Amino acid sequence: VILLKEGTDSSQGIPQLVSNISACQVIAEAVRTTLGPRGMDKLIVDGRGKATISNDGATILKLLDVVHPAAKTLVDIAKSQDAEVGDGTTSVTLLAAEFLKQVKPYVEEGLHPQIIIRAFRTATQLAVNKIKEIAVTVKKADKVEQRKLLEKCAMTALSSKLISQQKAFFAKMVVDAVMMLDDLLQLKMIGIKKVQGGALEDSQLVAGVAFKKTFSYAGFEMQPKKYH
Amino acid sequence: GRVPEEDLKRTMMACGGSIQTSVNALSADVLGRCQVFEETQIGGERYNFFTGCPKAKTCTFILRGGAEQFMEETERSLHDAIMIVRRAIKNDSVVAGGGAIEMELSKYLRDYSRTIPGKQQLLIGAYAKALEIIPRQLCDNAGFDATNILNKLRARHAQGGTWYGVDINNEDIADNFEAFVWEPAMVRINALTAASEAACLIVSVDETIKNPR
Amino acid sequence: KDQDRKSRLMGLEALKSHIMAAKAVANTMRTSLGPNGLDKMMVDKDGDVTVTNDGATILSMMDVDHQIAKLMVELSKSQDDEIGDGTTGVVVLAGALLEEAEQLLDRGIHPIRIADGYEQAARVAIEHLDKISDSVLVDIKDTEPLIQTAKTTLGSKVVNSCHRQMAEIAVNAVLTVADMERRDVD
Amino acid sequence: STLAENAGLNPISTVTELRNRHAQGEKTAGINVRKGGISNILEELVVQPLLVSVSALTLATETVRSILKIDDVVNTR
Amino acid sequence: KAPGFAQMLKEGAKHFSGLEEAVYRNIQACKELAQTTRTAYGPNGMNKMVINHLEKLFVTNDAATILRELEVQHPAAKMIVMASHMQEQEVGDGTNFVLVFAGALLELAEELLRIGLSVSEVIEGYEIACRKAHEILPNLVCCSAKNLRDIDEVSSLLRTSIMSKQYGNEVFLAKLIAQACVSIFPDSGHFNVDNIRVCKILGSGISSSSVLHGMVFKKETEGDVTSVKDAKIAVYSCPFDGMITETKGTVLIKTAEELMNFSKGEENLMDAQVKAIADTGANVVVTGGKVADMALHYANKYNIMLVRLNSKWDLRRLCKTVGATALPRLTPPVLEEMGHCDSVYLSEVGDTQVVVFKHEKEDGAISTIVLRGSTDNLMDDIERAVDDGVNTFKVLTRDKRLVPGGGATEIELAKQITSYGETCPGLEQYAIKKFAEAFEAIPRALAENSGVKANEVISKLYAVHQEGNKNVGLDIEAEVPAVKDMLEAGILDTYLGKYWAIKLATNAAVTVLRVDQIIMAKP
Amino acid sequence: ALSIYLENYATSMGSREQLAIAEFARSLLVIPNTLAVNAAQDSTDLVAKLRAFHNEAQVNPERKNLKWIGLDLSNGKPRDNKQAGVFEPTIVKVKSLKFATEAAITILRIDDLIKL
Amino acid sequence: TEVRARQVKEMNPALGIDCLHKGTNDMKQQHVIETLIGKKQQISLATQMVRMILKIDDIRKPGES
Amino acid sequence: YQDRDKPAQIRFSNISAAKAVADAIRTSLGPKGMDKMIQDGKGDVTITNDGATILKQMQVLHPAARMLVELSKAQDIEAGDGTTSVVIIAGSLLDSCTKLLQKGIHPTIISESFQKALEKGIEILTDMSRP
Amino acid sequence: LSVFGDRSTGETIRSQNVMAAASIANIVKSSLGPVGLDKMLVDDIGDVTITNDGATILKLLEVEHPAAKVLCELADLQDKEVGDGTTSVVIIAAELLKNADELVKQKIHPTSVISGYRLACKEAVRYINENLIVN
Ligand SMILES: Nc1ncnc2c1ncn2[C@@H]1O[C@H](COP(=O)(O)OP(=O)(O)O)[C@@H](O)[C@H]1O
Ligand SMILES: Nc1ncnc2c1ncn2[C@@H]1O[C@H](COP(=O)(O)OP(=O)(O)O)[C@@H](O)[C@H]1O
Ligand SMILES: Nc1ncnc2c1ncn2[C@@H]1O[C@H](COP(=O)(O)OP(=O)(O)O)[C@@H](O)[C@H]1O
Ligand SMILES: Nc1ncnc2c1ncn2[C@@H]1O[C@H](COP(=O)(O)OP(=O)(O)O)[C@@H](O)[C@H]1O
Ligand SMILES: Nc1ncnc2c1ncn2[C@@H]1O[C@H](COP(=O)(O)OP(=O)(O)O)[C@@H](O)[C@H]1O
C-alpha cells in the first residue's frame, strides 16, 4: 500500500553503469561501419516513408534521436563536435564507447568509477601533450607551392575512385574552388550541380551561381545575355 | 524564371539583394548587382551565372559523367576534398591520419602506464587499447584483415615508426605522412578530449532518477 | 523519439535479407525478358486491368514497400532515358550478381571487396564490347539500314501489324530535329 | 583452403594467391605449414607420390558417381 | 479462509505484524533515501542522471535537486526530507549530512531494537548524545573568520563549500563569489542571498565569467539608446503587437484601400501610445513577449530605452526591487505604478551586451554573478554551487566559528561521545555509542566515493586522534588512502552547519522512531 | 618480469603471434594477483607495483631502479627476495611454464567431441 | 554452354541464342543487333546498383508506439 | 512444375549424411590439423588427429555415409596415404552436386561429366609430376 | 547423420573445455601460497578431508570431464619430475585458455595462438636463465 517508489523507477550501483556502457555501444554500432571514406552506407526511413542514404556519422545521429538517457549524452556531445568542426563525430563516438568497453570488466570486479575518471583525465592530458610534441608544421615544405601540395591531398581522397583516371583534372577543381573564396571559408558556400552525360573531364567550375535554367518559354533573339 | 530558391538564395548572398515575394516592394533596396554576367552553353543547355558579384563568397561546380552514380559518388568525395584543402590552409600543424597517431599514443601511454604504480596502470593501458579501434575499423570496413595489419602496424611503431598507419587502398601499412594523409592536430586533440569527457560523464553516473509522468 | 519498435538488424543476416528482396524483383521480371517473355497482369488502383511485358511499366506499377526494392525502381527510371531497350536486363543482371554474391558472403568476403571486384570486371566487360562491336553508318549519312534495324525490335510489340511504317517515321523525326553530322540528338 | 585454415592463414587469400602462382608458375607453389605461409614446396622437400593424388580422385569420384546413382533405398526382411 | 492477516483492521493498510517489525520497515524506507545520496557526498561525489518531469536530461550531484525531482512518497522518508528543507533555513549546506547521519541513526537503531531495547529508551540516548555533541562542538572550533572583508580570506574559506558541487573549478568560483560577497558585508546586519543574483549566459567556459554590479540581464538592449538615467521605468507584460479594443471595437474592412487606411490608423495610434510613455516622464520601457517593428522605431524616436525580458522570473525580480509592476494593457500611461532606478545602461562583457540596473546615486547593496558556459545544464549545476557558496558566508555574518572538515570532526565528536557512553551506566549507553558510530558513516561516505577501503580510513583517523592530532581528515586521493591535516590544507566547515544538521537529523530520526504504525484516513 | 619482456618481444615478431605472446605475458600476472588476494591485499596495486619496478630495470640498468623485486605476503608490500631469502628452484618456474603451455596447447587443438 | 562452346571451338566471333526459333544462331544473319551504348550502360547501371546495395547494412525505421 | 513424386529427398539425405562425415574430418587435415576428442561408451576418452582412426570410432549408421568410411579403407589398402583427403574431396563434390541438382541436371549427366574431369585430371597431375 | 552416439562441434567446444579448466583452477586458486585457505573434500562415503595443499587436492579431486582429466594427468608429470609447482601450473594453464578463447572470438586461429605460446615459453626460459643466481 504505502511504498516509496510508486512508479519512480530507479536503479543504482554497478548494474546502472554497466547498463549505460552497453547502451553506448549501440550508438557505436550504428556508426561503426561508416568510419572512413570507403565506409558502408546507412539507410534511414522517416515516418512518411521517405528514404535517407548517407555514410556521414553526424547526419546519422541527427536522424536517430535515441531515447536512452546514456545514449543522449554521446549524441549531444557528437552534435556539438559537428557544429564546432563538422568532422570527427564518429571518432568521438567510437572512442567513448571503447573507453567504456575496456573499463567494463574492471567495473564488474569492484573497481570504483572515480578511479577510472582519474585515468582518463590523466591519460588524455598525456596524449594531448604527445600530439603537440610529435606534430609537424607543413607550410612550404620542399619549396613547393601550396597549390601543388593541396592537389596531392585532394587526389588522395579521390584515389582508386570512379574518377581515378582523370583525377588530375578533378584535383585542380577542388583547389581552384577553395582558392576563389575569401578568408572566411565554408563548405556550404561552394555549391555543386549535377549534369548527366558527357565525359568526366567536362565537369565545369563556374565562379558564380549556376543552375539548369529549365526556362524554355518564348523570348529568343531578344533579352541580351550580357550586362555590365 | 523557374530558378530554384536555393540557387536564388545562393545568388542573394552572392549579389547581396533580397528575394521579395510581391512585385510591389521591388526597388533598389532588394535589387542586386554583379560585374560580368554571361549565358553559356554547358553541354548544350544554357546556364545563367553572375561572375564577380560584390559579395562573391560562393561559387558552383558543374559535374559531368555517364550516370548519376558517377556524379553522386564523385559528389561525396569532393565535399571532403574541399574540407581537406580547407583544413590544411587553416591549421598548419597536422598529424598522420589513418589511425597512425592513435597507434603512437597507444605506445606512449602503454609504456608510460608501466612506470605508474597503482590502479592507474591497468586503466591507462586500457585507454591505450581503446585507441586501436580507429585503425581497426578502417581495416574491417575496407575488407582487410585487422589482425595482420594491426600486428604489422603495432610492430612498426615499436621499431621507430611514428606516421605509419592504415592504407584503405592497398591492403598494407604505409607512411600516411609521406602519403599526404593528414589531419589537423587540434581537431584530433578535441576528439580525445570530447571522448574522455563523454566517457567520464557516463562513468561518473551511478544512478538514474525518473519523475513519474 | 519513437525508439520503440525500431528496425534493428545488421551483418550477413541484413545483407542476405536485402539480397532476398532484390531477387524477388529480378525473378518477377526474369520471365518477361525477350520477345518470348511472359506478360504481367497489372491491376490498377482504380480497378483497371492491363497486360504487358514491358520492363519499365512493370517496375512503375510494382509498388514494393521494401526500401532496397525501391532503389531498383529508381535505377530503371534513369535507364529508360539512356538505354531504352534492356530495362529488364539491368534488373535481371543485378539480381544475378546479388544471388552470386550470397555464395561469397558464406566464404567470408566483405561486401565492399565484392563491390571492387565487380567494378574491375565491369571495366573488363566494357573494354571487351568495343572489340566485338561493328559500325553501320560510318562515314556516310544513310537512311536504309537505319530503318531496317529499328524495325526488327519493334516487331515484338503491338506495332507488329504495321511495324514497317513506324520505323520510317522515327527516322525522319530524329533526322529533322537533329543533324547526323553533329551526332547530338535531343 | 583447409590446409591454409589449419595453418592460421586466410582460407581464401591463400588459394586465391596460389591460383595466380599456378597460372604463372607451376605446381611447386603450395602451402608450407612449417614456416606458416606460401612457399616453394619443391625447395622445402615436401612431396608425395603420384598414386595418392590419382587414387584419391579415382576412388572418390567412383563413390560420388555411385552415391549419385542412388534413386532410393528399400528395406528388406 | 482463517487465519487471515493479523492486526489489519484500518482500510486494509499493510500493517506489519509483530514478527514483521513494522518499525524495521519505516527504517528501510529511510536507508534507501540515504543510498540515493550517500554516493554524492564529498568532492568526489557521483553525479545522478536525473530525468525531469518535462522529460529533460540533467546530470547533477546536488542533494536538493535529487530529492526535488525524486518524488518521495513514503511519509517516513518525507520527515527526513522535511529536515533537509529545514536545513536550508538558517544555513545553505549540510543537506546530505541530514540524510547520511539520520540514515545511520535509524540503521543502527535496528541493531538495538533487534536485541530487545525499547524504542523509547533509544530516543533518550540520541537526545542525550545530541545535547552532549553540542557541548563538544565548540571545543572543536579550530579557526574563526577575521571578518576583514578580505577576498584572500573569503575566497580561502569558501573553497570547501564550492567543492562537492563543482569540483576542480573551486579557484575561479571562490574568487568571483568573494568579490560579490565582500561588496555587501559593509552593509552591516543586512547580508542576504537575495542580493547576490546569478545570470547564466551561453559562452565558452566557466573561466570566462565575471562579476558585475546591479541587476544584470543577459538580453541586450533592443533599442538604439546606449545609456539613460531615467528613474521612471514602465514595465508592461503585454507585448508590442496589433492592438485590440477591450470593448466591442468591431473592425470591418472590404476594399484594399481600406486595409491600408486601417493599417495607417494603427501606426498613428501606436505613435501616440509610445508618445504617451514619454509624456509621463519615462524614457524606459520593458516588454515580455515580442516587440513590433514600427514600435521599435518609436522607442528610438523619443529615445525611449527598449528592454526585453522574456523570462517571467526576470520580470518579477524587478517588480520587488525598483517597483515597476506589469500591467495587462499594452502601454497604458500609468505613471503611478512605474519604478525608480538611479542608473540604467548597457555594457559589453565577454563579447556580449547585457542590460544593467546599477545604483549610482544610491549606496547600492545588490550584485550579480554573470556565469559563462557552453551548456545550460553545466551553468545550472554551477548556479547551485553559488547558492551553497554564498549561503556559507551568510552564516558567517553570525558567530564566526569554523571546524575541521573531511570527516575530522565526525571522528573526534564520535570519540568524545563514545567515552561519555562508556562511563555512563544504564541502558542509554547502547544508543549513545551507536550515536557515535553514526558519525563514522560520513568519513565512510567520503572514503567509498574516493575508491578507498573505508575501514582503513576509520582505523587511521582514530589512531591520530588517539595521539591528540585533532583537525585530521581524509586525504582526498585515489592512490593514497592516508590522511592529512585539514587545517594545513585549508579545508574547514561551518559551526552552525554542523550544529543545525546534528540537531535536525536527530529530531528526524527520533520522529521516525516514535512512529510505529502508518494509518490511512479520510476527511 | 616476463610480463614486460614478452610484451616487448611481441612487438618484434608480428605475423599473427603478437597478440598470443602478449596474452601469454598477461596470463602470468595471475600468480602475483592470486597470491595478493590470498594475502588480504589489493591485487591490482601490488601487481602494478611489481611491474613498475621490473619495467624500470628494462628501461636502463642504473642502480637507482630496483631489481628482482618480489612480493611479501605478510607486510603487503614488494620486497627484494635476494635479501628476504624467498627463493625457488629454477626447474620449477621452467617446467611449470613448459607443462602449463603444453596443456593449453593440448586443449586448444580440441575443436570437436565425439561420444559413443 | 552450346553457344559458348561455339564461340571458342566452332568459331571465334560471337554468336547468340535463337530465341524466336528461326533457322539457327549467329544473330548477325538474323539481324538482331543492340547499341554499344546500350550494353555499356546496362552492365554499368547493374554494377552500380549492386555496389549501392552491398554498401548498405542497416535499414533503420522508427515504429509507432 | 508440380513435382509430385520427390525421390530427390533421398539424394539430399545421402549428400547431407555424406557431407557430415567430411565436415567433421576436415579440421584434422595436415600436420597442423586440429585434434578431435573421442569418448568410448565405457567412459574412456582419447585424443587423436588421424582421420582413419576417427572414422572407425564414429559408428556410422547411414548407408551413404558408410560408403565414405569404406572408401577411406580402400585408399589405405591401395596407397596407404591421403586417407583424410579422400573423404574431404567426396564431401565437397557432393556438396557441389547439391547446387547442380537444384538447377535441374540429372545425376547420370553429372556422373558421366565427373568421369571426364577425372580422365583429364589424371593427365594434368601426371604431366606436372617428377619422374 | 545417423550414428550410435553423439557429436558436438563449433567454437563452443573450446569454450566448454575453457570453462572446465577454469573451474578446476578456481578450486585451487584461493589455496595458493603458504597462507592458502583450506578446502573440504566430501568423498562418496561421507568423509571430509580438509587441506590447503594444491597437490593433495588434485590427487583427490574427482571431476568427470576430459579437459579436467588432462590437467590431472598433467599434475602427475609435474609431481614426479620436480614435486612442486602443480598449483601454479593448473592456474597458469587456465588463464592461457581463457585468454586464448577470447582471441579465437577475434578470428585468431588456435594454430597462431599455439605458435605464439611456444615462442613465449622459449624466450621466457631464456630470460629466466639469464637472470638466475647460482647456489
Ligand atoms: N585517404 C585516407 N586514408 C586513410 N585513412 C583515412 C583517409 N581518409 C580518412 N581516413 C580516416 O578516416 C577516419 C574518419 O574520417 P572522417 O569521415 O573525416 O571523420 P568521421 O568518420 O568522424 O566523420 C579518420 O580518422 C581518418 O584517419
Ligand atoms: N529478335 C530477337 N532475337 C533474339 N533475341 C532478342 C530479339 N529481340 C530481343 N532479344 C533479346 O531480348 C532481350 C530483351 O529485349 P527487350 O525486350 O528489347 O528489352 P526488355 O526485355 O528489357 O524490355 C535483349 O537482351 C535481346 O538480346
Ligand atoms: N578537499 C576536501 N577534502 C576532504 N573533504 C572535503 C573536501 N571538500 C569538501 N569536503 C567535504 O564534503 C562535505 C560535504 O560538503 P557539501 O557538499 O558542501 O555539503 P553537503 O554534502 O551536505 O551538501 C563536507 O563535510 C566537507 O568536509
Ligand atoms: N610437412 C607438411 N607441409 C605441408 N603440407 C603437408 C605436410 N605434411 C602433409 N601435408 C599435406 O597434408 C595433406 C594430408 O597429409 P597426410 O596427413 O599424410 O594424409 P591424411 O591427412 O589423409 O592422413 C596432404 O595433402 C599434404 O599435402
Ligand atoms: N615464503 C614465501 N613468500 C612468498 N611467496 C611464496 C613463499 N613460499 C611460496 N610462495 C609462493 O607460493 C606459490 C606456491 O608454492 P608451492 O605450494 O610450493 O607450489 P604449489 O602451490 O604449486 O604446490 C609459489 O608460486 C610461490 O610464489
Nearest to B98 by CA among B139, B126, B128: B139
Strand partners, E199: E370
Write out chain H residues lying below 8 Å of F109, CB-based. 34-35, 47, 49
What is the Å distance from ligand 1's center to B98 Cα?
Answer: 6
CA nearest G55 in B: which residue? B141
E356 phi, psi to nearest 5 deg? -130, 140
Rounded Cα distance between E334 and E349, Å, is 34
Grouping H, G, I as helix, E, B as strand and the rest as coil, residue E344 is strand
Length of chain A: 228
Secondary structure element (H or E) that encloses residue A71, with its range: helix A69-84
CB C19 within 8 A of CB C114: no
Per-position DSSP letters for E267-302, written without gaps between them: HHHHHHHHHHHHHTT--EEEESS---HHHHHHHHHT
List helix spans (H) across E151-292: 151-162, 170-182, 256-279
Task: Work out the minimum CA distance from B25 to partner chain A, whole angstroms.
Answer: 23
Which burial class, exposed, middle or buried, applies to I13 when counting CB atoms under 10 A from its CB (0-12, 13-18, 19+)?
middle
| Residue among E342, E332, E189 at smallest CA distance from E273 | E332
HSE-up (13 A, CA, CB side) for residue F13: 20
Rounded to whole angstroms, the Cα distance separating C31 from C36 reads: 9
Q: Give SS3 for I91.
A: helix
d(CA C66, CA F71) in angstroms, rounded, equals 65
Give 3-state DSSP helix, strand, coil % of chain F, rounded to 5: 60, 10, 30
Question: What is the C-alpha to C-alpha distance for residues A206 and B62, in angstroms, rounded to an integer?
Answer: 7
Q: Chains touching chain G at 3 or more Cβ pairs under 8 angstroms?
A: A, B, C
Q: Which chains touch H (3 or more CB pairs under 8 A)?
A: D, F, I
Quote the CA–CA distance of E307 and E321 in Å, as a whole number: 16
Q: State how far the Cα of E409 lies from the Cα of E403, in Å rounded to an integer.
A: 7
What does the block give as the cell for H85? 583427403
Distance, CA of A38 to CA of B169 (rounded, Å) = 9
Size of interface D-H (CB pairs under 8 A): 112
Interface membership of C109 toward D (CB under 8 Å)? yes
Q: Which of E222, E245, E234, E410 is nearest to E299 (CA)?
A: E222
Contact at CB, C3 and A45, closer than 8 angstroms: no
DSSP, collapsed to helix, strand or coil, labels residue F70 as strand
Nearest to H31 by CA among H49, H46, H54: H49
User: Which helix or strand (DSSP H or E) is residue A165 part of?
Assistant: none
B115 CA: distance to closest CA in chain E (Å): 14
Task: Give SS3 for E393.
Answer: helix
DSSP 8-class letter at B16: I
The CA–CA distances, whole Å, from E165 to B166, B198, C50, E50 equal 44, 19, 75, 15
**Shortest alpha-carbon distance between residue C25 and chain B (Å):** 21
CA distance E247 to E259: 21
Find out whether D54 and H97 touch, Cβ atoms under 8 Å.
no
> How many angstroms separate the Cα of B78 from the Cα of each of A154, B75, B85?
8, 5, 10
Write phi, then psi, for E404 (nearest 5 degrees): -65, 155
SS3 B19: coil
From chain G, the residues in CB contact with C111 under 8 A are 54-55, 57
Q: Within 13 A of H54's CA, how many CA atoms are on the CB side? A: 28
Number of the ligand 5 atom closest to the C-alpha atom of I28: 21
Gyration radius of chain D over CA positions: 18
I near D: at least 3 beta-carbon pairs less than 8 Å apart: yes
User: Which residues, other chains included, contact I42 with Cβ-Cβ below 8 Å and sequence gap of 6+?
Assistant: I48
Nearest CB among E59, E66, E479 relative to B118 is that of E479
Chain A contact for C1, CB < 8 A? yes
F108: distance to nearest CA of chain I, Å?
6
Of E55, E70, E478, the CB nearest to B209: E70
Integer angstrom CA distances of residue E91 from A162, B192, E278, E497, H88: 71, 41, 46, 6, 84
Report the Cα A31 to chain-centroid distance in Å: 10
Ligand 1 pocket by Cβ (under 6 Å): A 35-37, 57, 87-91, 156-157; B 97-99, 134, 138, 166, 168, 181, 183
Q: Which three cell numbers stand for residue A166?
A: 582523370
Tell how far the Cα of B134 is from the centroid of ligand 1, in angstroms.
Answer: 9
Q: What type of residue is E227?
A: S
DSSP G6-51: IIIII-SS-----TT--S-S-HHHHT----HHHHHHHHHHHHHHHH
Between CA F1 and CA E520 the distance in angstroms is 69
Question: Exposure of F34 by Cβ count < 10 A (0-12 exposed, 13-18 middle, 19+ buried)?
Answer: buried
Residue with cell 590544507: E489
Q: Do chains B and H touch (3 or more CB pairs under 8 A)?
A: no
Residues in chain C with CB shorter than 8 Å from the CB of D12 are 107-109
Residue in D closest to H31 by C-alpha: D33
Parallel/antiparallel/unpaired status of strands E305-308 and E210-213: unpaired
Report d(CA C15, CA B206) in Å as an integer: 38
Which of C78, C112, C186 comes nearest B142 by C-beta?
A: C112
Rounded to the nearest angstrom, the minimum Cα separation between H10 and chain I is 13
Closest ligand 2 atom, residue G22 Cα:
3
- In chain A, residues with a C-beta closer than 8 Å to the C-beta of E374 are 80
Question: Is any ligand 2 atom within 6 A of the Cβ of residue C89?
Answer: yes
Chains C and D touching, counted as 3 or more CB pairs less than 8 Å apart? yes
Alpha carbon of E446 to ligand 3 centroid (Å): 8
User: Which residue's CA lies nearest to atom 14 of ligand 2?
Assistant: C34
For residues E439 and E506, what is the distance between their CA atoms, to the nearest angstrom?
12
- Cβ–ligand 5 distance for I33 under 6 Å, the answer yes
Q: Give the helix/strand (H/E) hosting I59.
A: helix I54-60
* Structural contact between residues G31 and C134, judged by C-beta atoms closer than 8 angstroms: no
Pocket test residue of B181, B188, B189 for ligand 1, highest count of atoms within 8 A of CB: B181
What is the number of alpha carbons within 13 Å of residue D45 lying toward its C-beta? 0
Q: Is A11 on the interface with E (CB under 8 A)?
A: no
Q: Please tell me if the CB atom of residue H80 comes closer than 6 angstroms to any atom of ligand 4.
A: no
| Alpha-carbon distances of E6 from E9, E24, E96, H48, H102, rounded to whole Å | 9, 17, 38, 70, 75
CA angle at residue E365 from E361 to E366, to 5 degrees? 100
- Distance CA(E314)–CA(E318), nearest Å, equals 7
Return the sign of the alpha-carbon dihedral for residues G17, G19, G25, G30.
negative
Q: Whose CA is nearest to atom 10 of ligand 5?
A: I33
Beta-ladder partners of C43: C49
From CA I39, how far away is CA I31, in angstroms rounded?
A: 8
Of E428, E502, E427, E416, which Cα lies nearest the Cα of E125?
E428
CA of H29 to the centre of ligand 4 (A): 7
H/E element, A54: strand A51-54
CA–CA gap between residue B130 and residue B208 (Å, rounded): 26
For residue F73, the ligand 5 atom closest to its alpha carbon is: 4
Residue B203 identity (one-letter amino acid): V
From B44, B141, B143, residue closest to C184, measured CB to CB: B44
Burial E276-302 (b: 16+ CB within 10 A, else e): ebbeeebbbbbbbeebbeebbebbeeb
Q: Which amino acid is located at F11 in the chain?
A: T
Distance CA H10, CA H8 (A): 5
Q: Does E183 touch chain A (CB under 8 A)?
A: no
Pairing mode, strands E343-348 and E353-358: antiparallel
Q: Are B62 and B47 in contact (CB under 8 A)?
A: yes
Could you tell me if E327 and E237 are in contact, meaning their C-beta atoms sit under 8 angstroms apart?
Answer: yes
**Is E64 near ligand 3, meaning CB less than 6 Å away?**
no
Which residue range(s) make up the domain with E218? Answer: 212-397
Shortest CA distance from C79: residue in chain B: B67
CATH assignment of the domain containing E363: 3.50.7.10
